Structures are given as C-alpha cells and as structure tokens.
A paper describes a structure:
Upon antibiotic stress Gram-negative pathogens deploy resistance-nodulation-cell division-type tripartite efflux pumps. These include a H+/drug antiporter module that recognizes structurally diverse substances, including antibiotics. The superfamily of resistance-nodulation-cell division (RND) efflux pumps plays a key role in intrinsic MDR in Gram-negative bacteria. These tripartite complexes comprise an RND transporter in the inner membrane that acts as a secondary active H+/drug antiporter extruding a vast spectrum of structurally unrelated drugs through a periplasmic membrane fusion protein channel connected to an outer membrane channel factor across the outer membrane. A comparison between drug binding of AdeB and Escherichia coli AcrB is made via activity analysis of 20 AdeB variants, selected on basis of side chain interactions with antibiotics observed in the AcrB periplasmic domain X-ray co-structures with fusidic acid (2.3 Å), doxycycline (2.1 Å) and levofloxacin (2.7 Å).
For structural elucidation of this RND transporter, we reconstituted AdeB in Salipro Nanodiscs sustaining a native-like lipid environment. A C3-symmetric density map could be solved up to a resolution of 3.5 Å. The AdeB trimer adopts mainly a resting state with all protomers in a conformation devoid of transport channels or antibiotic binding sites. In the O conformation, the PC1 and PC2 subdomains are in close contact constituting a closed cleft. We assume that the high prevalence of particles in the OOO conformation is not an artifact, as similar trimeric conformations have been observed in another cryo-EM structure of AdeB29 and a crystal structure of Campylobacter jejuni CmeB43. This would allow initial substrate entry in case drugs enter the periplasm, since the OOO state lacks substrate entry and binding sites.
Numbering used by the authors:
A (entry chain C): 47 to 190
B (entry chain A): 95 to 238
C (entry chain C): 239 to 502, 511 to 1023
Amino acid sequence: ATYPGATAKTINDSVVTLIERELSGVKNLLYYSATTDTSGTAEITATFKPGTDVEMAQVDVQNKIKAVEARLPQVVRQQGLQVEASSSGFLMLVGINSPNNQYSEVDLSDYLVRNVVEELKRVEGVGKVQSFGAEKAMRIWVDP
Amino acid sequence: KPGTDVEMAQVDVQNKIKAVEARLPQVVRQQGLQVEASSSGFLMLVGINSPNNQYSEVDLSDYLVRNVVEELKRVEGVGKVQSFGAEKAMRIWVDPNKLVSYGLSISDVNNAIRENNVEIAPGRLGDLPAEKGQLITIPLSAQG
Amino acid sequence: QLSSLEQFKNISLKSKTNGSVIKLSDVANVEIGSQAYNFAILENGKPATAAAIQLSPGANAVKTAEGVRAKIEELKLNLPEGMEFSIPYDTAPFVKISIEKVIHTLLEAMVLVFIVMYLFLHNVRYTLIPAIVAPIALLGTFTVMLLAGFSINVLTMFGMVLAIGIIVDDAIVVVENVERIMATEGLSPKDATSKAMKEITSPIIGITLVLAAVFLPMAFASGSVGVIYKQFTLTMSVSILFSALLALILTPALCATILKPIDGAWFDRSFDKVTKKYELMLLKIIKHTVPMMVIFLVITGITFAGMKYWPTAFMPEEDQGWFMTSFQLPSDATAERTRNVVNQFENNLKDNPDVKSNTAILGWGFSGAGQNVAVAFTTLKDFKERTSSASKMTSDVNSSMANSTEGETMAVLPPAIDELGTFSGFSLRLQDRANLGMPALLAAQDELMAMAAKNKKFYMVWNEGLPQGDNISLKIDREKLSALGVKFSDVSDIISTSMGSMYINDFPNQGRMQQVIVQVEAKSRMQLKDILNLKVMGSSGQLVSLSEVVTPQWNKAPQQYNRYNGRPSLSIAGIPNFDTSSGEAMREMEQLIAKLPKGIGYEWTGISLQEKQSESQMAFLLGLSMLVVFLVLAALYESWAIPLSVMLVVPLGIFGAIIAIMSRGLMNDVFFKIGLITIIGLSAKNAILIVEFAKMLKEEGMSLIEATVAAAKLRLRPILMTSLAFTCGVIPLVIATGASSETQHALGTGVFGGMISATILAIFFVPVFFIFILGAV
C-alpha cells in the first residue's frame, strides 16, 4: 500500500490498522506482519500455513481487503493496493554498467527501465522485477 | 447451492460484479462494493453499559468503536463486527438563518473548514537529490 | 505536449504583481533527471544500475535463470556502445551444483552398494540380481512423484540416497537365501528359489511393512518440518514398497532363470570362522542374561540423556558461495554517508580477499528503505579456488566494519531454506501486548539489546529495522496569521509544495511518455532555515517569512512502524554464537524476554517458529512411529513378546546415532531426525531378520536358546550384508566435502552411527532380548 510523502505514523494509523482488521480470520493464516517505512509505503505480509494453496489464499486476502478498500484515504485508493504472492530473496540481480563512462548512471537506469525490465519481466518464471533505478523524467527544479 | 464452495462462489460473484463496477454512479464506485460471504444471525452481541451514568451513550459507543471493535474483530473466528454505535466526530450544526444573515452558504462553511483545517504533506529535509555537501536529514512535519 | 527542454524552458508564466510575462527558465532550472532518486547501485565500486528478479510463486529457479540468461544474451546485441550487461549476483548456479552433487553422491552410493554385494556374493550375476531392483524402484518412485505433484529437490534426492541402502535389502535377502540354499543343498536354481521363497516370503513382507510404516507418521507432522519430512516419506516409502514388489515379483524370476550352477577368495574361510567365533561369543553372552539386560538399560539411559540434552537446531547453514551485508546508519544519515560506509566496506574487501563480485544497493534493504540503509550482496569467488569460508569471511567483515565507519554493518550468511528468512540465524518479534506504547516497547528493546551484549551464546543480536529519529514538527500560530492578514491555505500550500516533489503529467520523450516532476531545487530544501526563509503575501502588501508564523520543535519518534499478529512489535534478528546451536539461543532468548517489563511478549517468526514446531513435535513422531511399528509387528507375528523384543533394539540404534552426532559435533537438526526414524526402521529390520527365524525354529520344536543361536548364526550373513550395504552407501554422505556438503554431513552422520550400532549392537542384543522376553512369559 502506497501513500506518497506521508510518514510511517500516518500509514500505520490510517492504512495498516484498517487492512489488518480484515486479515484476521483468513483461512490457514500462519502469522501476519506489517512494516511501514519512511518511503510512504507499507508492506503487509500475511504468511499462510505451509503447503496451503497460495492462489486461493491470495484470493482470500483479496476478498478481505475488498471490504476495506472503501475506507482508505483517497490517495491510497487511487494509488492501488498491489496484492501479490510474494517472495523474500532475489533469484538474481541483472545489472548494466558503463566501463568507458560513456553513459552516466541515470542513462543506464533509463535504458534498463525502458528496454530491459519489460523484456525481463516477459520471461516465463519471472515473478517480479524490481528496478533499482528510475526512468528518465523532465525535472523542474524551481527556486522559491 | 448447499455445499457449494463458498470461496470460489464468492470469487465468481466478484468476477461478475467487476464487469459492472464501471457503470455504477461515481459515489457508489468511490464508496466500494463490499462483497463478503455473509451470515444472517448474530453469534453474540457484546455490549458496554454505564451503571453509574459516568459516561453518556455517545462516550460508550466511542470507546467501543475505538478500543473494542478492532480487538474483537482481531479474534479468530469473528467474521464481522457490526457496531451499533458511531465513533465520536466533530459536528458543526450550522444555522441557515444566520448563514443567510451574513450572506453565506453551507458550501462556504464547508470551504472554510476545508481550508483552515488541512493536512499538510510532511516532506523530508535534505531528501535526494541531495546537495553535494549535506550530512543531516530530518523528516519535517507541518501542523495545519 | 512539449517534448524538449527548449519547449519547457519557454513556458510562459504570468507575473503576479508586476505584469511581466516571464518564462519557466526564469524561476526554475529545467533538466532531465530520474523520476525518483531513491536507490543507487555500486557494482564493484563503480556506479551502475540493476534489476532484482524475484522468482515467481512456486516457479523453477534453474529454469528461470536459464531463461533470464538467454534473454540477457539476446538483449546484449542491441546495447549501444559503452553499456555492458552483468549478473553480479546469481543463485541458481548453486541450485545446479547442489542437485548435481546430490545425484553424484546417489551414484556413488549405488557403486558402493554394488561393490559390497559383489564382495559378499563374488559373482556379477548374484550381485546383479539385487542391483537391478534399485534403479527400477527409483524410477517407480519418480513416476509416483510426478503423479503426486512432487519435484526433484535435494530433499527427495537425499531420500533416494538414504533409500539406496534400504531398497536393495529385500533383494539381498532373497539372493542370499537362494545362494545359501544352492551352497548347502546343491538344489537346482528353480526349486532352490522356490524353497527360499517359501522360507522368507513373510520375512520380506514384514521387513517391508515395518520400513514403510515407520516413515508414515513423520509425513503427518505440521509445518515446514512436515513439508520436509514428506519428501523423505514419499521417496523412501514408495521406494521400499516398489523394492518389495520387485523382490516378490522380478527377483524370483531372475533367481529362477539366470542363476548358474554353483561351481567356483580367502573371505570364505575367514568369514565362516568369523561366524563361528560370533556364535561362541553369542553363547557366552546368553550366559549372562541379566547383566546384558543391565547393560541395555544403561545404554537406554545414556541414549535418552543424549537425545534430551544435546543442542537442537533446524537446518544446517551452508556456504552458498555468497552473503549479504546490511548497512544501517543512524537516522539523519544522508546518501553521502551511506556511500562512504559502503565505499569503505567495498574497499575493505576489494583486493584483500578472493571474492567474485560485490554489488551494493544504496537506499534499499530488507526490512526498510531510506537514505540510511544499504544492502551489499558480496558473492564469494568460488568453492574450488577458495581460502576462507563464508562464515570465516563474514566474521572478518563484521570485525573490520564495527570499528571504522559509523553505522551497523553486519555481514550475514544466506538462510538455510530459500524463502523462510533472508539471513541465517533466528528472527524474533518483540510484541507490545498490553498497549504499553512505542516508547515503552523501544526501551524494552534496547534493554534486551543490553542484556544480549554480555551473553556468551550470543554474538550480535541487533535490530532488524529502522531506528528512532529526530523530527521537526512546525506549530502554526493562527493568531499571528489573522493579525498579519495572511490566508492559512497559503501557508499550507507553501509548506507542502516547498517539500513535496509533486508530479504533474507526462510528455513524449523519444517515443515514450515520461513524467514531468516539479520540485524545490536541491539547495533550497536542505537545512531547516531554508524552509523558514519561504515568504507569503500578507495583508499590508508586504511579504512575511515563515519563521515569523511557524515555530519548530524537535521530537524523538520511531521512523518505522512494525506490527505483528496485530500488535505493534519490533523485529529482533540474531545469530547464535560459535559452539551454540539455534535451539539453545532460542531458549536463551525466551529467558531473557522473561526478564523484560510486563506486557511485552515475544513471538518466533520464520525459521525460528518452524524450528520451535520441529522441537515441539519430535516426541510424538517418535511416540507414534514406534507404536505403529510395534502394532504392525504384533499383527505380523501374532504375539506380544516378539514385538517387544524387536522394539528393544531401537535404543541401540539411537545410541549410536547420538554417539556419532556428539563425536562429530553436529546438532539435533531435522536431518538427524530423518536419520533417527531411518535407523528405527533399519534397526527393526535387523531385529526381524533374527526374531522371525528364531520363532519359526522354536515352532519347529527346537529349544528356545538353541533356536535363537541357530537363527542368529544363519541370518548373520544377510544382516551384515544389508547393514554394510546401507552403511557404505551412506559413507558418501558422511565424507562429502564439496559445496552443500554440510547438509549431507548432518543427514549421513546420524544414520551412519545408528547403523553401526544397530548392527554391531544388534547381533548380540536381539538374541538376548528374544530369549529374555520369551522366558519372562
């Protein structure tokens, strides 16, 4: 759950508690955790019993949060609640470097986001691709 | 049908309403369609009374909503907790006679409250891209 | 829509008070940067980028890696000059080398058991009769794996390695009995095979039923410990069932058609002489009946003591060829400080040790992001060109980082199981169960950290999260605003917009719609004073700075909010100290936590919780398995004394198992539990081999003692044959030294000691048990 800018106290008292109020009583719930950090982001991880069907359990979580998607702040709602059967460690960490220094780090991250991350995600068996580098963007540094 | 998997059937209903969640009025949509595998009768009816009359009914309902309903819902086996009592809230009983007397409309009072009582995004002092030469980063806070 | 800096800089902008139409470049430096500058990447000290690929739920690691490497090779062709692709962190190579090492040890087990059976029969034929049942039983196990929805992992493979020495038991029994009949009576292969069948058909079935029923309850255990038991259960049980089907169906045909007439070095007289000395020693033993039962009571006592006292673990750590290094700098730390810390750590292991590649991610870290958090995935050079081990390296990094750069850098090993935890060790969650508030929980937390600093079984039990930090809350004096005549909404706008970095809309940049972010320039949002230099329009027409209407105040508050099972909590990582198991640390943590303020609870999460379940259900798995074997035995031999005599041999196998574990210095992990049950089964096998024939000879009219000694002597050869077979088949597990060798060490040491015991201590005690239990009734 994203809620940009807002510090962790706001995500903790306005968002996480709401979702956690529905996470209970889910089928085969082994244990559940929720961490809100300073990036204006909360990760609520419901860990189910070992061997439980991850698909149907993911469905159960979707159903429970559906009952709490109308009370979250407007930004949270119109920013989406990405619910995914997740993992902890990275399988591998593909990267792009520039030994001749012909491209600054921003150009490498741009190229990686625009022409690599999509085609990496389009591989069978790749569940998530987290890009540690942001796409290019027209920045307007105003001067107050 | 009796004995049908309530989970997959709930999923089916979710799918069917997904095809009709884009035509409903805007309020309906941005108020959410809470789809839940439901029940008819209450298992039990927890309540809070005040025999010494030290707390009015509004205070009891407030305490019940703020410190009981959440922890009741956080019990395993509790599917829904319907609170027959509303949380406290700052009520502004306007007087349309005086509203007209000064020349204002309730829309105005609505705007005055929206402006004198705003949620100011926190921001972060020294967030990236940092100025070469910074060693401290304090998360700012506003209070409006 | 604008597409170039030129069009953006010339964006008109009406000037509020004067009238001049200014451009955007007058009030703002327009430039192309990145959407958000959250994370950075240091690959081998150089700035670069990266893309962490998280495996799909239940996908294949090796296949996914094959696909991603192929896609990288494909995309290499379209890389402008200057860009180079790299995989500076990859785990599936280790999956490929682990599964290959396990298949290699499986083949080594096959070869060694074939050599043992050849040495005990001396004809390729006689030894080929059983050695054809192992591959067929294994292939049937594979078909059942597929039909049940299983996979080929190191767990089921380890189950097959254990099974190699158990599959061929039945066939060894049949071939030994047929060989023996053709040696003593000289009968033709066909009718000799028929007589051997009419003799040991029920022994074979009994051994089978016992071995397949001892492995059933373990698969019923709950939790990951069960998901681990289920592999070994399915593998070994189906392997034993197919081994029995073959011993009853295929090996009789082989023994009937392709067994050549006995015509045909020193082993023969020495082995027989050995058998005779054993028989005389057995008679001397049976003499002192009560003393040997006293020695058995003593051994059971020692065994129970060891199984109750020896430290417990869950899974052995392994040198996966790489490790992680989490840098947690205090709050108020800037990305420059974390770059300094990471640069120090990167330069600390740059040319001194032998590592393959060290990649650091700035701004990202398991359990929290932020400028003051980095995670560096140093990948060890290799295993064949190594010097210091993963655990010997991490220790070096920890000690060479705790004293130089400010922070919390703690190099840590990869976990045991892939998606259980991020690091090796235990992970506890200190919960706030009585609404004590955050400050109380954090005080309890640092106290617990103070108590864990002087413990010997603890090393660094740090906090896996973000630390408290100073915030700058602004109080707005509304009365001063109304007196100055300034709208409040304008002050709110100015603050929020002055810090926010808001995003507006997109623009077409080289064919792709990229964002257009606006934000107060860097040098105007760094220190607090800059904020207090913002100005708003008053009532009298003159500007009023924010410093006159807002008052800052510095609070101390937690910057990350963690919740567990509903209640606020704090993730407390920890790794046990050298010479201390994970079980001891867990128990020690419980005591420490018991020494904490009231209302503060504690919960185990991940590996710790799974380990707790293992330890809390190891008694019922041994209580239920033993009872199942007893009941099956009583059903098979229609008595209550025979199954007691067969059960009385289990503590001897456990005895050796515990002895081996204590001597080697391993722990009471789940692999040892797997061997514990395997040795129960094999012990029962060695006992039945004697007890059945002794019962038959006693029913044939022979005296109890004479029947007992005759059956022991006649079945010494199959017992030793099968025993040495399984022991030499597991020797590859104990002696393995490559990569992923610690799992094999833990899984083989137990069964090795247990088999050595349940064969050297069985052929002498099972006759004693039989005679005693039958005389006492």
